[PDB]
RNA sequence: GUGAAGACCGGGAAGGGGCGCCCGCCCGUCGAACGGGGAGCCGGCGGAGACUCCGGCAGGCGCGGCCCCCGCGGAGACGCCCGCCCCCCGGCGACGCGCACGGGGACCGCGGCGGGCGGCGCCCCGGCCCGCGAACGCCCCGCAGCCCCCGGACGCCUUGCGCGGAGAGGGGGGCCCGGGGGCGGACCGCGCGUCCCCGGCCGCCCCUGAAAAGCCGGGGGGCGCCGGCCGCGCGCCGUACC
RNA sequence: ACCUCGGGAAAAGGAGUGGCUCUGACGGCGCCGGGUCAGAACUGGAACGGACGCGGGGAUCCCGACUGUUUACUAGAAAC
C-alpha cells in the first residue's frame, strides 16, 4: 500500500513536472480515479545570496492523479492535514492562505537544513 | 484468387521481360523487402523497410539497422552469437 | 591520338564525386583521454541513409568531454544497432555490437568493422555494406593484432587501433539484380559519372588503345605490363593469370 | 476594421482614446434597424450597429464637442 | 465570359511561394490573392511529434504566451517524453545508491 | 607554397572587441529580378502607370513621450497577453514521386425571382444579357490526424487499409487544421464535373529527395523587465512598351 | 500455335449501334437528387462510330533480347 500521507513523489505531468511533492491525504478511490492531495515545492530557494550563503520558497497545494506522481522512499512528515483538506484547496481563497502557510513551513526547514533530498531539484538531463 | 499461377506473384509487373532468372531472384528479394518483420522491442510484426539497411517498426517507432532486403541477415545472426559467446567467456 | 577516358577522369571535372546532400564523413569517434582510460557513453539519435553509400549511417551523440555541450558523431552502422541504443567507445568497453574498443581488447574470432589501419586514424577498413574484419591473433609482445581484411589478406595492425564490434548493415545488397539500365543510372547518379560504359573496341583508333578496325577486336593481348605508360594501361594490368578456372 | 464592444468600450474610447470622428450612418441604403456609428481611431475604425434611432441618441448624447460628428 | 486573369507575382514561374487563390472582388472581378506556405509548428526534439498548443504561424507574429506551453521543457519536449525523462533521471540516481549500499 | 616569370596553388598561421575584465583555433557585404525571405488589399483617376498615384481600409519593422508593473488556472492534454542577456540543447525556415480517396476555393451548369433586350410566317413563361463583395480585425465552428482522463476488451473500422493489454471500443475532453460561417470592412436555392490548393493514408527506391540568413522556444546561470496608449519614421535601385 | 507462363491478344473471326415512346435498376424519404447501366415496343429508300476522331490482318525467315542512344545539315540501323 505505497500511497500514504507522508510519501514524497515526483510530479511527472503538468506545469509542476519534475518537482518533488508530498502527499498530505490519500483521496478516497472514486469514479474520477485514484487521486491524492499533494503539497510540494513549485520553486526552489534561490541562487548566490552572499558567496554561497552568508531567496524565497514557493509551494503548490493541488490535488493530482496518482498515476501522474512517481513514488519515492523519502518522507517529509509534517502534521499538514490539519490545515490542508478537500473543502479547502478546492476553495478559491483558503487555498492561497494554505499555500502561504506551507511556503513558511518549507522555508523554516530549508534554513534549518532539514529534508535536503526533498529540497533538491530532480536533475532532468534534457 | 491466385491471379498469377506461377511464381510471377510480385514479378507480374515486369511482364514478358528481363528473363526467368532475374524474375526468380527478384521474387525472393522483393517479397523479403516489402514483408513485415517482428520488431525486437514492439514484438509486433510491424517492421518495414525505409531504405536499404534501415527498418522502422510503425508501432514501436524505433529504427534499426538491418540487411538491405531483410531486417536480419544470416551473417549478422551468427556474428551476434559469436560476440555473445566471446563476451560471456571473457567475463 | 586523343587523351583516353581514364586520363580525362583524373582532372575531376564531370567525373568528380556527386557529394552534394551526403551526410558527412563517416568516421570513428576521435581518441580522447576518456577513451584511452575508461569509456564514453553515446546514444544513437538516428540511423539515416548516405546518398552514395549502401550501408546505413548513424548519428550517435556523445557528451562533450572538453566542454559543456553534446558532440554528434557519424558512424557506419553495424547491423542490429537501434535508435536509443547506448554505445560505449573506450578501452574499458563491454563487447556489445556498436561499442568501439581497441583491437587488443577485442577477443579473437570477433566480427569487427570500421577498423583503424593505424591508431587514431578514425576509420579505414571494413566500411562497406555487409563487410567485416575478424580478429585472428594478438602478439602481446609486439603490441600488434593480426586481422583478416574482407579481401582475405591478413594485416598486422597495432593493438591500439580501434574497431566497432559487429558486421556493417546493408548486408546482401548486391544479391538483387539491378534488372534495368535505369536502376543503374539511379545508383551511379548518387556516386560519379562512370556509367554508361563504352567498350574501347567500340571506340575509334584515336580514343582507345583497343581502338578500331574492320572488325571489333582487341588487336594485341589485353594483358599490359605493370610498367605501362599512363595512357597505355587499358586492359588487364599485370595479370598473374587470365581465364575462368576451378577454384 | 472591428465592431466596438456595445457602447461600453465605444464611449470609453470616445471619452479619451483617439476618436478622430464618429459617423452616425443611419439609413445605410435606406434600410431599417440601421444606425451604424463609425468611430475613427488611430489603431482601427470601429462600428457599433444600434437597433433604434433613440438608442443611437443616448450614445450621441455625451459625444464630445471636440469629437466630430458626421451624418449619412 | 472570360475569367482568365494575369500573374500577380514578379515572374510567371509558379514555384511553391508563387501559388494564388482566386476570389471575386467588390467590383465583380476575379483577383489573385497570394497563398503563403503554412510555417509548421515546433516538433518535439526527442521523438518527432508536433508540440500541442502552438499555432502554425511564423513565431515572430505569434505573442509570447501563444509561442510557449505552460510546462517544464514545454515547446521542446512533449509530455510523454518529459515524463520519461523525469522517470529515467530519478531511477538512475536510485540504482546508484543501491550500488553504494 | 611553387614557377624564369606572367601567374598558379593553399588552413595550420600571435586570424576576433569596449573597460576592469571576460569570452574566442581558422574568410566571404561572392554567387539565385524562378530557391529561402517581416508586411497589401479594395475602389477610383490619366493620352501614355499602378500591388507604386489618389481615396479608404489594414499589415510589418523600428524611434521617442507617457503610464503601468515582475505569472495564475486545470485532474491532465491544454488554457490564458505575455521579460531581457550569456552559454548550452533544440525547433521553424525545409523540402521527393505516384494511383486513388476526402475537404475547401474558384470556375461551371441548372432552376427560381428581380432588372434590361432581341426576334416573332407559326410556336415561345423554350432565346440572350446583368444580378457585385477584397485584404484585414474579433467571435464561433472545422474532417482526418495527434494527445488527455476513466477504465479494462474480438472488437473498431477503409475506397484501399489500418488499429488495439505499450490500452481498443465507449464516455467525456485538449491541440493543430494555407479552410468555412457571423458581424465589422461595406438576390435565393441546388447539382455534376473541371482546375487549383490542402489533408489523412497507402505504395515506391542498390534513387531517400539542399543549405543558410533570419526568427522563436527549453535547460542552467545571471538579471529586471514586460506590456498598454499616443505621435513620427521607413533611405538605395528596378518599374513605358514588345 | 507458341511461351521465359507474365504473354501472344485488339490474335483470327462474328453480331449489334439512329430516332421516338416507355420500363426497370441504383443511392436518394420531410422523399428528394442523380445520369449511367440493362430490357422493351413502334418507326425509317435495307439507315445509324452517318461529319469528326479512329489497328488492315495472317504465315514465316535473318538480326538485335528488351525501354533507351547515335552521325544538328544525305545512313535511326543489324551499330552504341
XYZ file of N, CA and C in Angstrom, chain C residues 24-201:
534
model
N 27.941 13.394 -44.325
C 29.254 13.873 -43.870
C 30.268 12.765 -44.003
N 31.452 12.929 -43.417
C 32.463 11.851 -43.430
C 32.170 10.894 -42.283
N 31.858 9.638 -42.594
C 31.631 8.650 -41.525
C 32.984 8.285 -40.942
N 33.161 8.444 -39.639
C 34.491 8.219 -39.033
C 34.300 7.721 -37.606
N 35.265 6.977 -37.077
C 35.184 6.544 -35.659
C 35.381 7.776 -34.778
N 34.800 7.779 -33.582
C 34.943 8.924 -32.652
C 36.435 9.145 -32.417
N 36.861 10.391 -32.251
C 38.292 10.691 -32.037
C 38.785 10.059 -30.739
N 40.025 9.577 -30.735
C 40.610 9.021 -29.492
C 40.783 10.189 -28.523
N 40.354 10.030 -27.277
C 40.438 11.127 -26.290
C 40.909 10.516 -24.972
N 41.177 11.334 -23.959
C 41.718 10.814 -22.688
C 40.700 9.856 -22.086
N 39.413 10.158 -22.237
C 38.386 9.314 -21.602
C 38.240 8.058 -22.448
N 38.524 8.122 -23.745
C 38.527 6.848 -24.499
C 39.721 6.013 -24.048
N 40.901 6.618 -23.937
C 42.121 5.845 -23.613
C 41.987 5.223 -22.227
N 41.395 5.930 -21.271
C 41.163 5.307 -19.948
C 39.678 5.351 -19.615
N 39.004 4.201 -19.548
C 37.544 4.199 -19.327
C 36.767 4.306 -20.624
N 35.453 4.532 -20.553
C 34.618 4.537 -21.782
C 33.658 5.722 -21.807
N 33.432 6.292 -22.984
C 32.478 7.423 -23.154
C 31.147 6.828 -23.612
N 30.020 7.266 -23.040
C 28.703 6.698 -23.416
C 27.989 7.593 -24.427
N 27.548 7.038 -25.550
C 26.806 7.807 -26.556
C 25.452 7.185 -26.791
N 24.502 7.943 -27.334
C 23.120 7.439 -27.567
C 22.852 7.549 -29.061
N 22.296 6.524 -29.693
C 22.129 6.598 -31.170
C 20.880 7.432 -31.425
N 21.076 8.697 -31.796
C 19.928 9.597 -32.040
C 19.153 9.139 -33.274
N 19.848 8.724 -34.335
C 19.158 8.398 -35.601
C 19.948 7.379 -36.413
N 19.296 6.620 -37.301
C 20.032 5.770 -38.283
C 19.540 6.261 -39.642
N 20.393 6.919 -40.429
C 19.905 7.538 -41.689
C 20.556 6.912 -42.928
N 20.405 7.533 -44.102
C 20.940 6.961 -45.365
C 21.931 7.952 -45.973
N 23.129 7.508 -46.362
C 24.091 8.406 -47.059
C 23.801 8.328 -48.553
N 23.876 9.441 -49.279
C 23.475 9.444 -50.709
C 24.239 8.390 -51.508
N 25.554 8.292 -51.352
C 26.332 7.374 -52.205
C 26.721 6.082 -51.523
N 26.310 5.886 -50.274
C 26.725 4.683 -49.523
C 25.545 3.737 -49.409
N 25.742 2.458 -49.707
C 24.675 1.472 -49.464
C 24.433 1.258 -47.988
N 25.501 1.173 -47.196
C 25.360 0.916 -45.748
C 24.687 2.095 -45.053
N 23.712 1.875 -44.153
C 23.144 2.970 -43.390
C 24.181 3.631 -42.471
N 24.015 4.921 -42.203
C 24.943 5.634 -41.296
C 24.215 5.737 -39.962
N 24.810 6.364 -38.956
C 24.115 6.529 -37.663
C 24.616 7.775 -36.947
N 23.700 8.603 -36.458
C 24.106 9.791 -35.683
C 24.147 9.364 -34.231
N 25.338 9.252 -33.660
C 25.455 8.911 -32.222
C 25.925 10.173 -31.517
N 25.218 10.585 -30.471
C 25.591 11.814 -29.736
C 26.339 11.422 -28.462
N 27.577 11.885 -28.319
C 28.411 11.608 -27.126
C 28.392 12.879 -26.284
N 28.734 12.865 -24.982
C 28.835 14.100 -24.223
C 30.118 14.834 -24.637
N 30.168 16.164 -24.509
C 31.453 16.854 -24.799
C 32.325 16.732 -23.564
N 33.446 16.030 -23.697
C 34.414 15.885 -22.586
C 35.172 17.193 -22.400
N 35.531 17.837 -23.506
C 36.329 19.081 -23.460
C 35.531 20.166 -22.760
N 34.250 20.288 -23.077
C 33.493 21.419 -22.523
C 32.169 21.061 -21.888
N 31.086 21.735 -22.299
C 29.788 21.557 -21.602
C 28.653 21.131 -22.538
N 28.864 21.057 -23.850
C 27.716 20.728 -24.720
C 27.533 19.248 -24.986
N 27.033 18.883 -26.171
C 26.938 17.458 -26.568
C 27.512 17.349 -27.986
N 28.366 16.363 -28.284
C 29.028 16.278 -29.624
C 28.422 15.141 -30.440
N 28.165 15.365 -31.727
C 27.494 14.338 -32.567
C 28.507 13.677 -33.496
N 28.544 12.345 -33.510
C 29.494 11.588 -34.364
C 28.697 10.896 -35.472
N 29.257 10.775 -36.674
C 28.593 9.995 -37.746
C 29.329 8.672 -37.894
N 28.636 7.550 -37.717
C 29.315 6.236 -37.726
C 28.682 5.330 -38.775
N 29.464 4.456 -39.415
C 28.855 3.452 -40.329
C 28.175 2.527 -39.334
N 26.926 2.151 -39.632
C 26.111 1.447 -38.617
C 26.277 -0.061 -38.696
N 26.642 -0.761 -37.591
C 26.669 -2.196 -37.634
C 25.205 -2.632 -37.631
N 24.957 -3.825 -38.126
C 23.579 -4.354 -38.159
C 23.111 -4.543 -36.723
N 21.853 -4.242 -36.428
C 21.335 -4.534 -35.080
C 21.339 -3.324 -34.182
N 22.132 -2.310 -34.525
C 22.092 -1.063 -33.731
C 20.722 -0.412 -33.925
N 20.185 0.215 -32.875
C 18.827 0.800 -32.953
C 18.850 2.215 -32.406
N 17.849 3.018 -32.749
C 17.748 4.385 -32.192
C 17.521 4.261 -30.690
N 18.208 5.068 -29.888
C 18.113 4.990 -28.420
C 18.934 3.856 -27.855
N 19.962 3.410 -28.565
C 20.918 2.425 -28.009
C 21.961 3.204 -27.219
N 22.676 2.576 -26.282
C 23.782 3.265 -25.574
C 25.093 2.672 -26.076
N 25.896 3.452 -26.795
C 27.131 2.908 -27.418
C 28.309 3.438 -26.607
N 29.219 2.561 -26.179
C 30.384 2.966 -25.356
C 31.657 2.904 -26.199
N 32.389 4.004 -26.347
C 33.696 3.962 -27.050
C 34.807 4.103 -26.020
N 35.525 3.031 -25.696
C 36.541 3.194 -24.650
C 37.468 2.019 -24.528
N 38.511 2.143 -23.711
C 39.408 0.986 -23.500
C 38.666 0.022 -22.590
N 37.909 0.554 -21.638
C 37.039 -0.297 -20.790
C 35.617 -0.313 -21.347
N 35.411 -0.934 -22.506
C 34.063 -1.021 -23.107
C 33.657 -2.489 -23.201
N 32.383 -2.792 -22.952
C 31.897 -4.192 -22.988
C 31.810 -4.658 -24.441
N 31.870 -5.971 -24.674
C 31.847 -6.487 -26.067
C 30.401 -6.599 -26.546
N 29.782 -5.471 -26.868
C 28.408 -5.498 -27.417
C 28.442 -4.827 -28.789
N 27.519 -5.145 -29.684
C 27.571 -4.602 -31.070
C 27.458 -3.079 -31.008
N 28.348 -2.352 -31.685
C 28.179 -0.892 -31.676
C 29.315 -0.258 -30.915
N 29.736 -0.898 -29.830
C 30.785 -0.319 -28.961
C 32.093 -0.250 -29.741
N 32.926 0.750 -29.460
C 34.252 0.854 -30.129
C 35.310 0.574 -29.071
N 36.107 -0.472 -29.256
C 37.198 -0.753 -28.297
C 38.498 -0.987 -29.065
N 39.687 -0.812 -28.450
C 40.952 -1.112 -29.119
C 41.066 -2.591 -29.507
N 41.713 -2.912 -30.627
C 41.721 -4.321 -31.125
C 42.405 -5.280 -30.153
N 43.367 -4.830 -29.356
C 43.943 -5.761 -28.373
C 42.875 -6.225 -27.411
N 42.021 -5.308 -26.963
C 40.932 -5.656 -26.018
C 39.961 -6.611 -26.712
N 39.693 -6.405 -27.999
C 38.690 -7.254 -28.705
C 39.207 -8.692 -28.720
N 38.404 -9.729 -28.395
C 38.902 -11.101 -28.352
C 38.990 -11.720 -29.751
N 39.760 -12.796 -29.909
C 39.978 -13.385 -31.258
C 38.707 -14.075 -31.757
N 38.419 -13.986 -33.055
C 37.183 -14.563 -33.620
C 36.031 -13.578 -33.663
N 36.241 -12.346 -33.194
C 35.146 -11.348 -33.119
C 34.995 -10.625 -34.454
N 33.763 -10.502 -34.952
C 33.479 -9.761 -36.204
C 33.584 -8.265 -35.885
N 34.439 -7.525 -36.593
C 34.639 -6.074 -36.303
C 34.533 -5.286 -37.611
N 34.232 -3.988 -37.545
C 34.045 -3.228 -38.801
C 34.488 -1.795 -38.514
N 34.794 -1.003 -39.543
C 35.295 0.386 -39.364
C 36.584 0.310 -38.554
N 37.403 -0.704 -38.823
C 38.692 -0.904 -38.106
C 39.666 0.188 -38.530
N 40.557 0.579 -37.632
C 41.519 1.660 -37.931
C 42.776 0.994 -38.492
N 43.272 1.476 -39.630
C 44.519 0.916 -40.198
C 45.657 1.220 -39.232
N 45.692 2.442 -38.683
C 46.750 2.749 -37.685
C 46.067 3.471 -36.538
N 46.527 3.391 -35.258
C 45.791 4.007 -34.156
C 45.477 5.482 -34.430
N 44.336 5.947 -33.934
C 43.927 7.353 -34.150
C 43.948 7.661 -35.644
N 43.318 6.845 -36.487
C 43.141 7.171 -37.925
C 41.661 7.464 -38.123
N 40.865 7.333 -37.073
C 39.387 7.449 -37.137
C 38.774 6.718 -38.331
N 38.959 5.403 -38.478
C 38.250 4.616 -39.510
C 39.020 4.403 -40.795
N 38.999 3.175 -41.333
C 39.709 2.844 -42.595
C 39.180 1.560 -43.236
N 39.317 0.413 -42.570
C 38.985 -0.887 -43.204
C 37.617 -1.411 -42.790
N 36.920 -2.123 -43.682
C 35.625 -2.787 -43.380
C 34.521 -1.750 -43.202
N 34.249 -0.945 -44.231
C 33.286 0.174 -44.094
C 32.133 0.008 -45.083
N 32.131 -1.046 -45.891
C 31.053 -1.158 -46.900
C 29.960 -2.124 -46.459
N 28.823 -2.175 -47.133
C 27.659 -2.922 -46.596
C 27.970 -4.396 -46.425
N 27.741 -4.939 -45.227
C 27.924 -6.393 -45.093
C 29.343 -6.748 -44.729
N 30.303 -5.927 -45.139
C 31.734 -6.240 -44.911
C 32.083 -6.252 -43.428
N 33.079 -7.046 -43.047
C 33.557 -7.138 -41.645
C 35.017 -7.594 -41.682
N 35.743 -7.451 -40.578
C 37.120 -7.981 -40.475
C 37.055 -8.930 -39.288
N 37.930 -9.927 -39.190
C 37.864 -10.750 -37.958
C 39.195 -10.676 -37.227
N 39.148 -10.712 -35.903
C 40.409 -10.721 -35.125
C 40.967 -12.134 -35.252
N 42.225 -12.258 -35.656
C 42.824 -13.596 -35.886
C 43.687 -13.901 -34.672
N 44.637 -13.024 -34.351
C 45.562 -13.308 -33.234
C 46.122 -12.017 -32.660
N 46.570 -12.038 -31.408
C 47.239 -10.852 -30.817
C 48.655 -11.232 -30.411
N 49.656 -10.455 -30.809
C 51.022 -10.699 -30.289
C 51.156 -9.666 -29.185
N 51.228 -10.097 -27.934
C 51.196 -9.072 -26.865
C 52.606 -8.534 -26.658
N 53.615 -9.219 -27.196
C 54.978 -8.646 -27.112
C 55.142 -7.536 -28.149
N 54.579 -7.700 -29.349
C 54.810 -6.670 -30.397
C 53.672 -5.651 -30.366
N 52.699 -5.832 -29.464
C 51.530 -4.914 -29.359
C 50.889 -4.819 -30.734
N 50.770 -5.953 -31.419
C 50.199 -5.979 -32.779
C 49.119 -7.048 -32.809
N 48.102 -6.850 -33.633
C 46.999 -7.824 -33.751
C 46.842 -8.181 -35.226
N 46.798 -9.466 -35.561
C 46.523 -9.870 -36.954
C 45.018 -9.765 -37.180
N 44.590 -9.227 -38.321
C 43.145 -9.187 -38.660
C 43.049 -9.734 -40.071
N 41.904 -10.275 -40.462
C 41.727 -10.713 -41.861
C 40.841 -9.683 -42.529
N 41.393 -8.949 -43.484
C 40.625 -7.908 -44.192
C 39.497 -8.567 -44.997
N 38.382 -7.908 -45.409
C 37.295 -8.594 -46.094
C 37.829 -9.313 -47.339
N 38.925 -8.827 -47.921
C 39.531 -9.484 -49.107
C 40.069 -10.864 -48.747
N 40.465 -11.089 -47.507
C 41.112 -12.351 -47.115
C 42.533 -12.086 -46.696
N 43.100 -10.993 -47.194
C 44.508 -10.658 -46.896
C 44.641 -10.431 -45.389
N 45.736 -10.886 -44.782
C 45.875 -10.767 -43.312
C 46.775 -9.577 -43.005
N 46.305 -8.656 -42.170
C 47.062 -7.416 -41.885
C 47.437 -7.386 -40.412
N 48.689 -7.070 -40.109
C 49.100 -6.910 -38.699
C 48.920 -5.431 -38.359
N 47.948 -5.101 -37.509
C 47.664 -3.682 -37.153
C 47.982 -3.516 -35.674
N 48.231 -2.291 -35.235
C 48.602 -2.068 -33.822
C 47.430 -2.457 -32.929
N 47.716 -3.022 -31.758
C 46.672 -3.478 -30.814
C 45.921 -2.240 -30.354
N 46.563 -1.080 -30.467
C 45.943 0.202 -30.045
C 44.802 0.591 -30.990
N 44.838 0.153 -32.251
C 43.832 0.569 -33.248
C 42.445 0.170 -32.787
N 41.456 1.013 -33.044
C 40.080 0.775 -32.556
C 39.197 0.187 -33.656
N 38.107 -0.479 -33.286
C 37.167 -1.063 -34.267
C 35.782 -1.134 -33.631
N 34.734 -1.009 -34.448
C 33.349 -1.106 -33.938
C 32.909 -2.561 -34.023
N 32.473 -3.133 -32.905
C 32.048 -4.560 -32.859
C 30.850 -4.761 -33.789
N 30.888 -5.760 -34.668
C 29.705 -6.046 -35.495
C 29.980 -6.099 -36.985
N 28.962 -6.416 -37.781
C 29.101 -6.546 -39.248
C 28.351 -5.351 -39.824
N 28.893 -4.653 -40.821
C 28.224 -3.412 -41.308
C 26.844 -3.782 -41.848
N 25.852 -2.901 -41.703
C 24.472 -3.223 -42.119
C 24.308 -2.935 -43.603
N 23.202 -3.355 -44.202
C 23.074 -3.227 -45.662
C 23.500 -4.529 -46.284
N 23.689 -5.560 -45.462
C 24.215 -6.846 -45.948
C 23.368 -7.482 -47.026
N 24.017 -8.045 -48.043
C 23.299 -8.654 -49.176
C 22.598 -7.651 -50.049
N 23.288 -6.584 -50.439
C 22.669 -5.513 -51.254
C 22.866 -5.858 -52.722
N 23.976 -6.508 -53.048
C 24.289 -6.809 -54.469
C 23.641 -8.119 -54.919
N 22.983 -8.837 -54.015
C 22.276 -10.091 -54.380
C 21.141 -9.781 -55.354
N 20.435 -8.674 -55.137
C 19.308 -8.282 -56.018
C 19.860 -7.876 -57.376
N 19.326 -8.377 -58.504
C 19.752 -7.897 -59.809
C 19.366 -6.429 -60.021
N 20.221 -5.629 -60.650
C 19.822 -4.240 -60.994
C 18.656 -4.325 -61.976
N 18.615 -5.347 -62.835
C 17.467 -5.630 -63.747
C 17.400 -4.666 -64.920
N 17.359 -3.370 -64.654
C 17.172 -2.414 -65.759
C 18.355 -1.464 -65.815
N 18.639 -0.907 -66.982
C 19.677 0.129 -67.086
C 19.267 1.298 -66.205
N 17.972 1.561 -66.101
C 17.500 2.713 -65.323
C 17.892 2.618 -63.875
N 17.792 1.429 -63.285
C 18.202 1.236 -61.872
C 19.694 1.516 -61.718
N 20.493 1.204 -62.733
C 21.935 1.520 -62.691
C 22.147 3.028 -62.726
N 21.408 3.739 -63.572
C 21.596 5.202 -63.709
C 21.314 5.850 -62.361
N 20.338 5.333 -61.634
C 19.949 5.938 -60.343
C 21.035 5.694 -59.301
N 21.647 4.516 -59.304
C 22.746 4.185 -58.365
C 23.979 5.038 -58.659
N 24.352 5.153 -59.923
C 25.568 5.904 -60.312
C 25.406 7.422 -60.169
N 24.193 7.939 -60.369
C 23.918 9.394 -60.218
C 24.254 9.803 -58.789
N 24.033 8.908 -57.833
C 24.401 9.218 -56.441
C 25.885 8.980 -56.189
N 26.687 8.768 -57.227
C 28.107 8.406 -56.993
C 29.027 9.279 -57.841
N 29.210 8.941 -59.117
C 30.098 9.723 -60.014
C 29.743 9.415 -61.464
N 30.171 10.254 -62.402
C 29.913 9.971 -63.835
C 30.850 8.853 -64.279
N 30.459 7.597 -64.074
C 31.282 6.480 -64.584
C 30.416 5.611 -65.479
N 29.112 5.862 -65.516
C 28.173 4.994 -66.264
C 27.382 5.874 -67.246
N 27.042 5.528 -68.538
C 27.252 4.204 -69.109
C 28.679 3.969 -69.616
N 29.057 2.715 -69.876
C 30.463 2.392 -70.269
C 30.532 1.943 -71.724
N 31.336 2.621 -72.536
C 31.539 2.214 -73.954
C 32.817 1.389 -74.019
N 32.746 0.207 -74.610
C 33.925 -0.657 -74.775
C 34.927 0.000 -75.726
N 36.222 -0.081 -75.440
C 37.271 0.520 -76.283
C 37.284 -0.035 -77.691
N 36.771 -1.241 -77.886
C 36.819 -1.868 -79.228
C 35.707 -1.187 -80.003
